[PDB]
DNA sequence: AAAAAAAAAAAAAAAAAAAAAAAAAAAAAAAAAAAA
C-alpha cells in the first residue's frame, strides 16, 4: 500500500481515470477484505491534510466502499476524526481540502455520512470559514438528495428536522458567505414543492 | 574722533514624524473559452 500512496502524491496520475479507478478498488479491497481500517484511514487523512487534489479521490473511495463493499465504518471513523481534528492558525490548505472532501462526500453518499452528522455539527463552532461553508453545503445537499426516497425521510425524521432547523437559524452569522451558503441550501431544498 | 569688539533683533534653510489618503493582498462569485 505504501508505494501507491507515495505515487499518488503527484497530480497528473490522479487525472487519468483508469489508474485512479484501479487504486480505488485496491484500497477498497485492502480496507474490506484485509481489515486494517486504521493505517489506511491515517494515510488518507495525511494525504488530505498535505494535499488539495486528493479530496475527490477520498470521497470516491468512500463511495465505492459504501456501495459495493458495504463497509460504512471507515467513513464513520473518518468523519469522527474530521470532527475532532484541530488546525493551526497559519495553514489554510488543510481546511480547504477538508471542506472539498466533505462537499464531494455529501454529493456522493448523503446517507452514509448523515449518521455521524451529529458530531460533525460540533465542528461548526470553529472560526474557520471554508469548513463552515462546507458543513452548510453538505447539509443542504444531503437533505436535498435524500428527499427523493420517502423511506429515508420517514426513517430519519428527527435528525433531518434538527438539521433543517439549524440551517434556518444559520441565516444570521458574522460571515456573509455562510449566510449565502445557507440561502443556497434552502433554495436547493425548495427546488421541489411536493413535500415540506 | 575714528576704529575694533560684544550684545541683540531679524532672518534663512534644515531636520522631524506620526496621521491620513491611496494602493496591494487574499478569498470567493461570475463570465468566457477549451475538452469530452
UniProtKB/Swiss-Prot annotation:
Protein origin, superkingdom: Eukaryota
Places the protein is found: Nucleus; Chromosome
Secretion signal span: none
Disulfide bond sites: none
Family: Belongs to the CND1 (condensin subunit 1) family.
Subunit structure: Component of the condensin complex, which contains the SMC2 and SMC4 heterodimer, and three non SMC subunits that probably regulate the complex: BRN1, YCS4 and YCG1/YCS5.
Additional remark text: Present with 2540 molecules/cell in log phase SD medium.
Biological function: Regulatory subunit of the condensin complex, a complex required for conversion of interphase chromatin into mitotic-like condense chromosomes. The condensin complex probably introduces positive supercoils into relaxed DNA in the presence of type I topoisomerases and converts nicked DNA into positive knotted forms in the presence of type II topoisomerases. The condensin complex probably also plays a role during interphase.
Protein name: Condensin complex subunit 1
Originating species: Saccharomyces cerevisiae (strain ATCC 204508 / S288c) (Baker's yeast)
Amino acid at each position: 500500500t505504501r508505494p501507491l500512496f507515495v505515487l499518488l502524491e503527484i497530480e497528473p496520475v490522479t487525472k487519468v481515470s483508469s489508474l485512479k479507478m484501479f487504486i480505488q478498488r485496491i484500497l477498497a479491497m485492502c480496507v474490506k477484505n484485509h481489515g486494517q481500517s486504521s493505517s489506511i484511514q491515517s494515510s488518507l487523512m495525511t494525504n488530505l491534510t498535505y494535499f488539495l487534489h486528493l479530496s475527490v479521490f477520498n470521497a470516491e473511495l468512500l463511495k465505492l466502499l459504501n456501495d459495493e463493499y458495504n463497509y460504512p465504518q471507515l467513513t464513520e471513523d473518518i468523519l469522527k476524526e474530521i470532527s475532532t481534528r484541530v488546525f493551526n492558525a497559519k495553514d489554510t490548505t488543510g481546511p480547504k481540502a477538508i471542506s472539498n472532501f466533505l462537499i464531494k462526500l455529501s454529493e456522493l453518499s448523503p446517507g452514509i455520512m448523515l449518521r455521524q452528522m451529529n458530531l460533525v455539527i460540533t465542528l461548526l463552532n470553529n472560526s474557520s470559514i471554508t469548513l463552515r461553508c462546507s458543513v452548510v453545503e453538505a447539509c443542504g445537499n444531503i437533505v436535498a438528495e435524500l428527499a427523493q426516497d420517502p423511506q429515508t425521510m420517514e426513517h430519519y425524521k428527527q435528525q433531518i428536522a434538527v438539521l433543517i432547523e439549524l440551517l434556518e437559524e444559520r441565516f444570521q452569522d458574522s460571515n456573509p458567505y455562510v449566510r449565502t451558503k445557507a440561502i443556497q441550501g434552502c433554495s436547493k431544498i425548495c427546488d421541489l414543492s411536493s413535500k415540506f
